[PDB]
Amino acid sequence: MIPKPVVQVPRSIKSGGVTKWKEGRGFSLGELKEVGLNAEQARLLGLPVDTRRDSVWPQNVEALRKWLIEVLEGKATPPEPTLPKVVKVKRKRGRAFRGLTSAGRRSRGLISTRFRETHNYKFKKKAKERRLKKRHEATKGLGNVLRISRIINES
Amino acid sequence: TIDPKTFYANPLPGKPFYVRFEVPSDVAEKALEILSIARQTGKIKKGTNETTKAVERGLAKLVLIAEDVDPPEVVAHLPLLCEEKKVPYVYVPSKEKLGKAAGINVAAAAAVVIEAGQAAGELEALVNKINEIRAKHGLNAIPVR
């Protein structure tokens, strides 16, 4: 059973000091260094590696040491390496016409802000919600119906 | 450090803006001969990227610049750089001939003699004659390195 990295949930000001743990994206380079591995070797063993993460958690180090011993003694089988296994690049047609060049990417807002905050993304996201009547788009004017009803029922 | 708006203030008629003084055909042909001789007996470099690095690094002795560079701004920095580093330079009329003298199969917009094995004597005479042309045109002298 290949271990999963454990990382701390970022402690917000809103939380007031309450903290919890979560499963991380991958093991940090500091944790891998304590068990004598680099990013490439760890990825060849099937481990998820996160070179962005700076923290080193002893519980992650301990889980890595236990599982590596099992692997190096023939008791555990490493999964497939966490490196690309296919290369699939399609021929592109009409990049300029679909706004995929750098000029198109700029006008779409993708240079200055995240994809989720671009205006075309907002247009498509809300169109889907209204088409499926999902979440808040099942009721138009939901906020005002709630607001007036709260006043009447909490007076 | 040289300010281009005064250096290139008064261009010559019928020449690109980066050409500062007129070189007679005899002087240009001599430079091409020296570059060819230096290629077999000494050390040369060719192409704008290698010529610019040689001038910056202080290893240049003579810089050859072609006058028919189609977008002129490819080589226009070289005369400014040579004046700053006090490296003598001369203009040659054709980049196709400059490339052939450099011993390649394509044109060269610029070339530089690093060391003149057997051409050192002729190189000194060429630099003096270039210096007279610069004085005629009003530019200060650049001594032979």
Binding site: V86, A96 | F17, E73, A76, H77
Partner: protein, 184 residues
């Protein structure tokens, strides 16, 4: 500093006045050529190389001239609420650079637009140069950057087999050089 760093000086403050003198003559010719013209070499070589240009067979550099200003917004000819009746100041969400790339692509059917950059402005026109590549040319197809546009296929049997071998050899090596340290 590469010669390309020095070539960029003509589009910086130190070289603007000399460059602006040059363009006043050059633009006279460009105003009389066809609106879209293929050129032998890019006008801003250092900028073109940063955007992916190389002088290979099948790489096309085209100069595009177009009228600047806002797009031709039409005054509506039927009923509208007042907010929808204005004309002046209303522009397109497309830049003129994208418009230039698209017009270039129409002149070279089947070619793919890689990138483009600004070259010059005058009172009425704006000039761009567009880099296009022919994805059918063998020189283009194998280029590491152009293959991202022209397509690339690596069989899964190649990568997976290579990765499996590397994993197997690593485990044997780590048995000798790492297992004692882990258990020590």
């Amino acid at each position: 500093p590469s010669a390309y760093q020095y070539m960029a000086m003509w589009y910086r403050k130190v070289g603007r006045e000399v460059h602006e003198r040059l363009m006043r003559s050059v633009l006279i010719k460009w105003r009389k050529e066809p609106a879209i013209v293929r050129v032998e070499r890019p006008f801003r070589l250092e900028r073109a190389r940063k955007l992916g240009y190389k002088p290979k067979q099948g790489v096309v550099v085209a100069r595009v001239r177009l009228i600047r200003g806002p797009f031709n917004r039409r005054r509506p000819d039927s009923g509208r609420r007042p907010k929808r009746m204005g004309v002046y100041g209303i522009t397109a969400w497309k830049s003129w650079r994208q418009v230039a790339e698209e017009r270039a692509a129409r002149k070279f059917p089947g070619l793919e637009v890689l990138n483009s950059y600004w070259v010059a402005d005058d009172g009425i026109y704006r000039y761009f140069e567009v880099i296009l590549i022919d994805c059918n040319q063998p020189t283009i197809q194998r280029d590491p950057l152009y293959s991202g546009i022209c397509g690339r296929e690596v069989p899964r049997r190649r990568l997976a087999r290579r990765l499996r071998e590397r994993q197997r050899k690593l485990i044997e090596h780590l048995k000798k050089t790492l297992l004692p340290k882990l258990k020590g």
